[PDB]
Symmetry: C3
Subunit: 173 residues, 3 copies
């Protein structure tokens, strides 16, 4: 089948209106650079509301057959930040290695990396990954974890993602 990839920008400010969604743009730019195979971006901007996040992810995974869903925003210690809660609530099983690696990688830049509650889990055969907010952090997190994603999707019997190996090298054992 053809790959559907969800992109969820979680932000009160973006939902109120911003000049440009630089976080969401950073994701689609990076994914376009990664992928040679055809794919369909399923994009949504939503507020920091746990229930709305959950609803969004559920539709993308269940109805829209998204094999991957990447979120940006709402992963810090602030009370409004509930993307990880929403993610835990919708996944059947978590992927501890992703949160581990993303923080380890982010800590190479900033001591405050350990304040991120970014996680990842599976809802059926969809992989959902929580990314940071800043465009450069987004690319740093994706460069770190995406090498494992096409294989993860393979094991989940999902679409076979083909990458521009001039940009990123998926590992497939």
């Amino acid at each position: 089948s053809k790959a559907k990839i969800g992109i969820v920008t979680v932000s009160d400010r973006a939902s109120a209106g911003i000049y440009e969604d630089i976080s969401g743009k950073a994701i689609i730019d990076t994914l376009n650079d990664y992928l040679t195979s055809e794919w369909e971006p399923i994009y949504q901007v939503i507020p920091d509301e746990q229930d709305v996040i959950e609803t969004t992810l559920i539709k993308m995974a269940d109805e829209q057959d998204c094999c991957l869903i990447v979120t940006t925003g709402g992963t810090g210690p602030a009370k409004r930040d509930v993307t990880p809660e929403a993610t835990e609530a919708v996944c059947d099983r978590m992927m501890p290695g992703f949160g581990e690696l993303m923080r380890a990688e982010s800590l190479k830049f900033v001591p405050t990396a350990i304040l991120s509650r970014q996680t990842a889990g599976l809802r059926g055969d969809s992989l959902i990954v929580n990314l940071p907010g800043k465009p450069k952090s987004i690319r740093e997190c994706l460069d770190a974890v995406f090498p494992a994603i096409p294989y993860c999707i393979d094991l989940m019997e999902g679409p076979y993602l083909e990458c521009n190996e001039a940009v990123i090298k998926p590992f497939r054992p």
Copy 2:
């Protein structure tokens, strides 16, 4: 706002007034070396009864306005070690990066650091962090995570902690 920092020593020999608490003292000494801003320790020595640990953390967070609460003791694989369980019970959202980093740093010279179930989380605007009992493990764990703590407290709209940069360098993005 003057910063109030909770210090909780959990110990099976602590109904004894003659217990010398070298762990609590290590926390106090470390924080004294770290901080240049004024702060106030709210200090309790308690038995390793999960119920009592929970009541203590809740009081310090809900009543006594502790911006940060640091526990020592009761984090290992022994059946009586229930400090993590108490911590999970009172926190409304967990901070997985703290336990990850504390073990990662500690295991380099103490392989048995991986046996610590130490964790961290947030109760409202209070950051709660589990340390091991041994003073050297205490300094090591605080050195690894404290650089992220002033900014976490900033994001919580708590007091503004300042540090002696020759001893420890908090990061603020």
Copy 3:
């Protein structure tokens, strides 16, 4: 007293009929290489059926007095990979530092290590640790965490395990 160690090969394929269980064999071979003290393998090969895994782990811990139980297989993101779910189910407290270290060490070879949901935890005084199926990965994970295992067993008041320190050095603080 006399050390009993559970070895569980989790594999639909092996359970169906296989010339040799290389996964289970890798574990036995590794332990024999590590230990100089007398120990008894409690060995079972079972399919990828969560209820079966849980039943097996419970028996090994509660009935068979296994101080350590090591699983191989079923830790990835595939539909039928349910070994970590079973381990979570039967353990009363988790040991997050094991999965962290195993993944972190594995990541130094192959970026897909982040796809393992391998975990570890305690059921009563039994330590249960998830390994991947591949024999090379089994030995790498064991090399990473075994140095902390004899001490953990000491803390849980179990058998005193002694090692060939020419192969592996248990750390006992």
